[PDB]
Amino acid sequence: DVNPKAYPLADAHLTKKLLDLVQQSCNYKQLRKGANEATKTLNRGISEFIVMAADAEPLEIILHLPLLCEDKNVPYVFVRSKQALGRACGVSRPVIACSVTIKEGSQLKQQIQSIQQSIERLLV
Amino acid sequence: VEKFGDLILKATEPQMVLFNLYDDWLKTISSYTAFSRLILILRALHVN
């Protein structure tokens, strides 16, 4: 199965919703790909939420992101596939961490808030 | 054409006169077709 270290793992419905929102954010120029860009967004406090994969090997290369999310008060979730997450980001290469940035006046704000509420009530 | 010949013969002093050889043509055809039709008409008038 999946690594137990990724405890806030989303189910199929939330996985589909998260991938759809990630694709929409990519279309709106509101997404950052890669763990390094996710870390940069977290340090600058311009991240709505962080989506990271559960197939990263080793998973410890992105387990620092939950700590930064807790420090910066940003929701985070784990998806079951690093290949579908990359495809949602618009990149054929697998992506193990994507960050949805904050853009004032964006039409995705309501969907972003709904996804944040869904994620923040799923970790435990 | 009579409308030009009679006007010029009847004139007594030089003057600038503005006409329109595409009178009602641009309302239905392009100026490219209007020019070709007018040149055909003028060629027929000159020839016979």
Partner: protein, 224 residues
């Protein structure tokens, strides 16, 4: 579990489909099954295509060119209109996208309004709940106005935004949550001069706890 496509992937697909279509048309033309394509002619292109023919027959060539242009425009309009959502079919798509599946669960939100005397506001709530399939009840008291709204999460969010920003005494969300099954029908706007029969009516649907919370919160606000 659908897989999205990169922009390069989309460009490749479109390019190869168009190339295949062009090759098929060229093969049809060469094989004789299709006549060769006549040159595209416009008003600015009239002389460059047929200057020899335009000189002898200006109006005839103009008519032919305009006929070709009108044929192209008519083909475009026929393609667009042929593939057009019927007026009833537009509603069917709209009437379905707003019908969330309440089979898994129903989302219930409870609101308490200090004053709900305005008939226009009543009509707004009733129509908005009806369009969004938001089955519920409105109970009118001197101060308590329990607005139980049940339906889909998208409709619930829209209706919450409705009374939070679109409609103005103040509006307070008592409790938003989910339940296994629905318990109220269409909007009725029941008038409840006294608390006892309002509680009894809420007990008829088995949702008296919403009334209890609204009454207790109103009492606490009054004491505060």
């Amino acid at each position: 579990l659908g897989v999205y496509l990169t922009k390069k992937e989309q460009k490749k697909l479109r390019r190869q489909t168009r190339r295949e279509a062009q090759k098929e048309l060229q093969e049809k033309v060469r094989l004789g099954l299709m006549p060769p394509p006549e040159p595209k002619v416009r008003i600015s292109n009239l002389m460059r295509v047929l200057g020899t023919e335009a000189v002898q027959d200006p109006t005839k060539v103009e008519a032919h060119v305009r006929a070709q242009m009108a044929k192209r425009q008519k083909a475009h309009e026929e393609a667009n209109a042929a593939r057009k959502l019927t007026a009833e079919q537009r509603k069917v798509k709209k009437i379905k996208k707003l019908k969330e599946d309440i089979s898994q669960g129903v989302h219930i939100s409870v609101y308490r309004v200090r004053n709900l005397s305005n008939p226009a506001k009543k009509f707004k709530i009733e129509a908005n709940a009806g369009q969004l399939y938001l089955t519920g009840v409105v109970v009118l008291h001197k101060d308590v106005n329990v607005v139980v709204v049940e339906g889909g999460p998208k409709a619930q969010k829209k209706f919450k935004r409705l009374m939070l920003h679109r409609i103005k005494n103040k509006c307070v969300l008592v409790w938003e949550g989910t339940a296994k099954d629905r318990s109220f029908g269409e909007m009725k706007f029941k008038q409840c001069p006294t608390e006892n029969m309002a509680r009894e009516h809420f007990k008829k649907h088995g949702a008296e706890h919403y009334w209890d919370l609204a009454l207790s919160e109103s009492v606490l606000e009054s004491t505060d």
